[PDB]
Subunit: 25 residues, 8 copies
Amino acid sequence: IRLILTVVPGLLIGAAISKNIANFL
Amino acid sequence: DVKTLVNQLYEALNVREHQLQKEVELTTQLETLQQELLPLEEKKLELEQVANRRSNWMAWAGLGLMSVQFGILARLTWWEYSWDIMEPVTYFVTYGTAMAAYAYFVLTRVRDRQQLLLLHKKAKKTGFDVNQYNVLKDQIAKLELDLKRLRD
Amino acid sequence: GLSDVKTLVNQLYEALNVREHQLQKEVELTTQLETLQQELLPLEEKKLELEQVANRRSNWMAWAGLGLMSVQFGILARLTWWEYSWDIMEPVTYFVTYGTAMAAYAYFVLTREEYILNDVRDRQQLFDVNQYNVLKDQIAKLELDLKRLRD
Amino acid sequence: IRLILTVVPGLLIGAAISKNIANFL
Amino acid sequence: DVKTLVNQLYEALNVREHQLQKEVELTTQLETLQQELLPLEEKKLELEQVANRRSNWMAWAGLGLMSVQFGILARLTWWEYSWDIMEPVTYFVTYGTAMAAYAYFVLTRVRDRQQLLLLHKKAKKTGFDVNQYNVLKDQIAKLELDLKRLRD
Amino acid sequence: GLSDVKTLVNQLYEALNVREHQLQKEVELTTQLETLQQELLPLEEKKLELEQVANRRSNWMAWAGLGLMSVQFGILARLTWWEYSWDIMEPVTYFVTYGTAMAAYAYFVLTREEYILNDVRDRQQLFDVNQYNVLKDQIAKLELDLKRLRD
Amino acid sequence: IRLILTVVPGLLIGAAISKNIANFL
Amino acid sequence: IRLILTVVPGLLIGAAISKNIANFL
Ligand SMILES: [Ca+2]
């Protein structure tokens, strides 16, 4: 349960940060 | 000559009621040893848990980082860019991640006996002297086995 | 230390009392060795049983791992070469390989964490290998001394 | 013998399931 | 009383000439035990060398198979075909090699002491008992050490 | 066997001659502990020297490996992103990675083969760890007996 | 020395066998 | 500190050697 709660938020956080960095350029 | 002399000595000191004396002395020496063992054991258990939490946390963090890298690449090669332009970026990101894992390994550096020796070496923590705990466990095991023989 | 010298005098008395020191001691040595082996038998049986029960598990688990790897290979091979061309399914195979490596890593982390957490909990709440090993030592020393006495 | 009987059915099963899933879409 | 008895027995049997007698008895006991140990070392050395030949040969065969595959891929990827058609074959050949290596590592199945114990359990050949060998090594070690203390 | 029972009598005699049974025995145990430790020190010196001379080697070897891998990384990145395109440098990078992995495995097998050959040859031609080990065990038992005697 | 004598013949053997198999089709 | 001083020079050295080898052809 905790495994899913660790991975999935990390993946979504990675997506949003890449979104924002691409926005930044 | 000396045979009758050791016979007289046996009659004097070794009253020959020594069997039950051996039983009771054994079953109290065992308790004294266990009481002597418990502090060493609690030190070992605390040390093991403190060296376990670290590895657990580090492993979970490593999994989180792999997932974040996955997310960064999957949001790049399917929304912002095309696959072909981000093909070499992914290969070199994978290469760089492998190199960083290798660098982490190089920077961080009977099976139970090996684990305990390395833990004591990494500790230099007094109060738990591994060889003392080992000879203690060995003496206790031998004594308890002799008690099993005595009770029969 | 009175008990110590008492046991010492008893040992000395038994040693001087023996007749045929080189013969009768060899007989008693055989009896003692036989008795210790008969005592060891249950410990060895328990160890063998526990080893087998903990080994067939790992064999089945690795076999399942191989089956799953082959299943994934089959999925990729048909998709790449029958349904869609390779040019459109290059990213899918890369990211599925990534997902598979992460799942393998996640399985190792789960088994390690679960096993070690279960062990520490059992140790904090609480087949003794130590007496079995001490028994092997005593019996090997006895057999060696018997060998030396025989020839 | 058992090795072949474990791998090959798995590979064929993977192919057929991928077939069916692609059919499904 | 009994103290005077053991004093008389000390003068009787414990002649007290046992100092030099102990030195010479020990320097011969050590040779005796070493002569006893030798066959065990021969058996262990032979067994370990036979189990090492096999590992070397298998690792060399592995390297040979690795290089042959690399050769085949290179020739097709630059002479007989183009890179476009040989990307999926390359990836799937790498996948197949990984699966085969894993199938091999599954069909095969204090650090030195663990290794020796596993080797003995796997090979299980009579004439060499690791336990008697260990206890003999430890007894001869303690005797050499005591002899060092005596020579001073 | 007569010498053995004589040694039993000798132990008995050293036991009976004691004055201040627990005090002088505690003193003698302290001297024994001191003597064994003074003897143990040279072995620990040898072990620490050997461990360090065997640890720095692996550290430097791993650093060299990491540096070489970084050099290859840099080579591939510059050839891929500036001079050429990824379309033309795909097979080159794949086969260079293959070659690097094969060379690493070849280096491992070569050091393994050389090490085992040298070790078996030296063993056939021929810091005693086992006397160090029995020294640690004996000195620990003595320190433990001293503690139990203290209180 | 032996390392070279193991790898290089293997690579050449791989090339020739791939040659022959392509010839075969 | 030493980690950076090991990696970065290696990467730059790799770049320059690839430069020179491409120059060579
Ligand atoms: Ca490609």
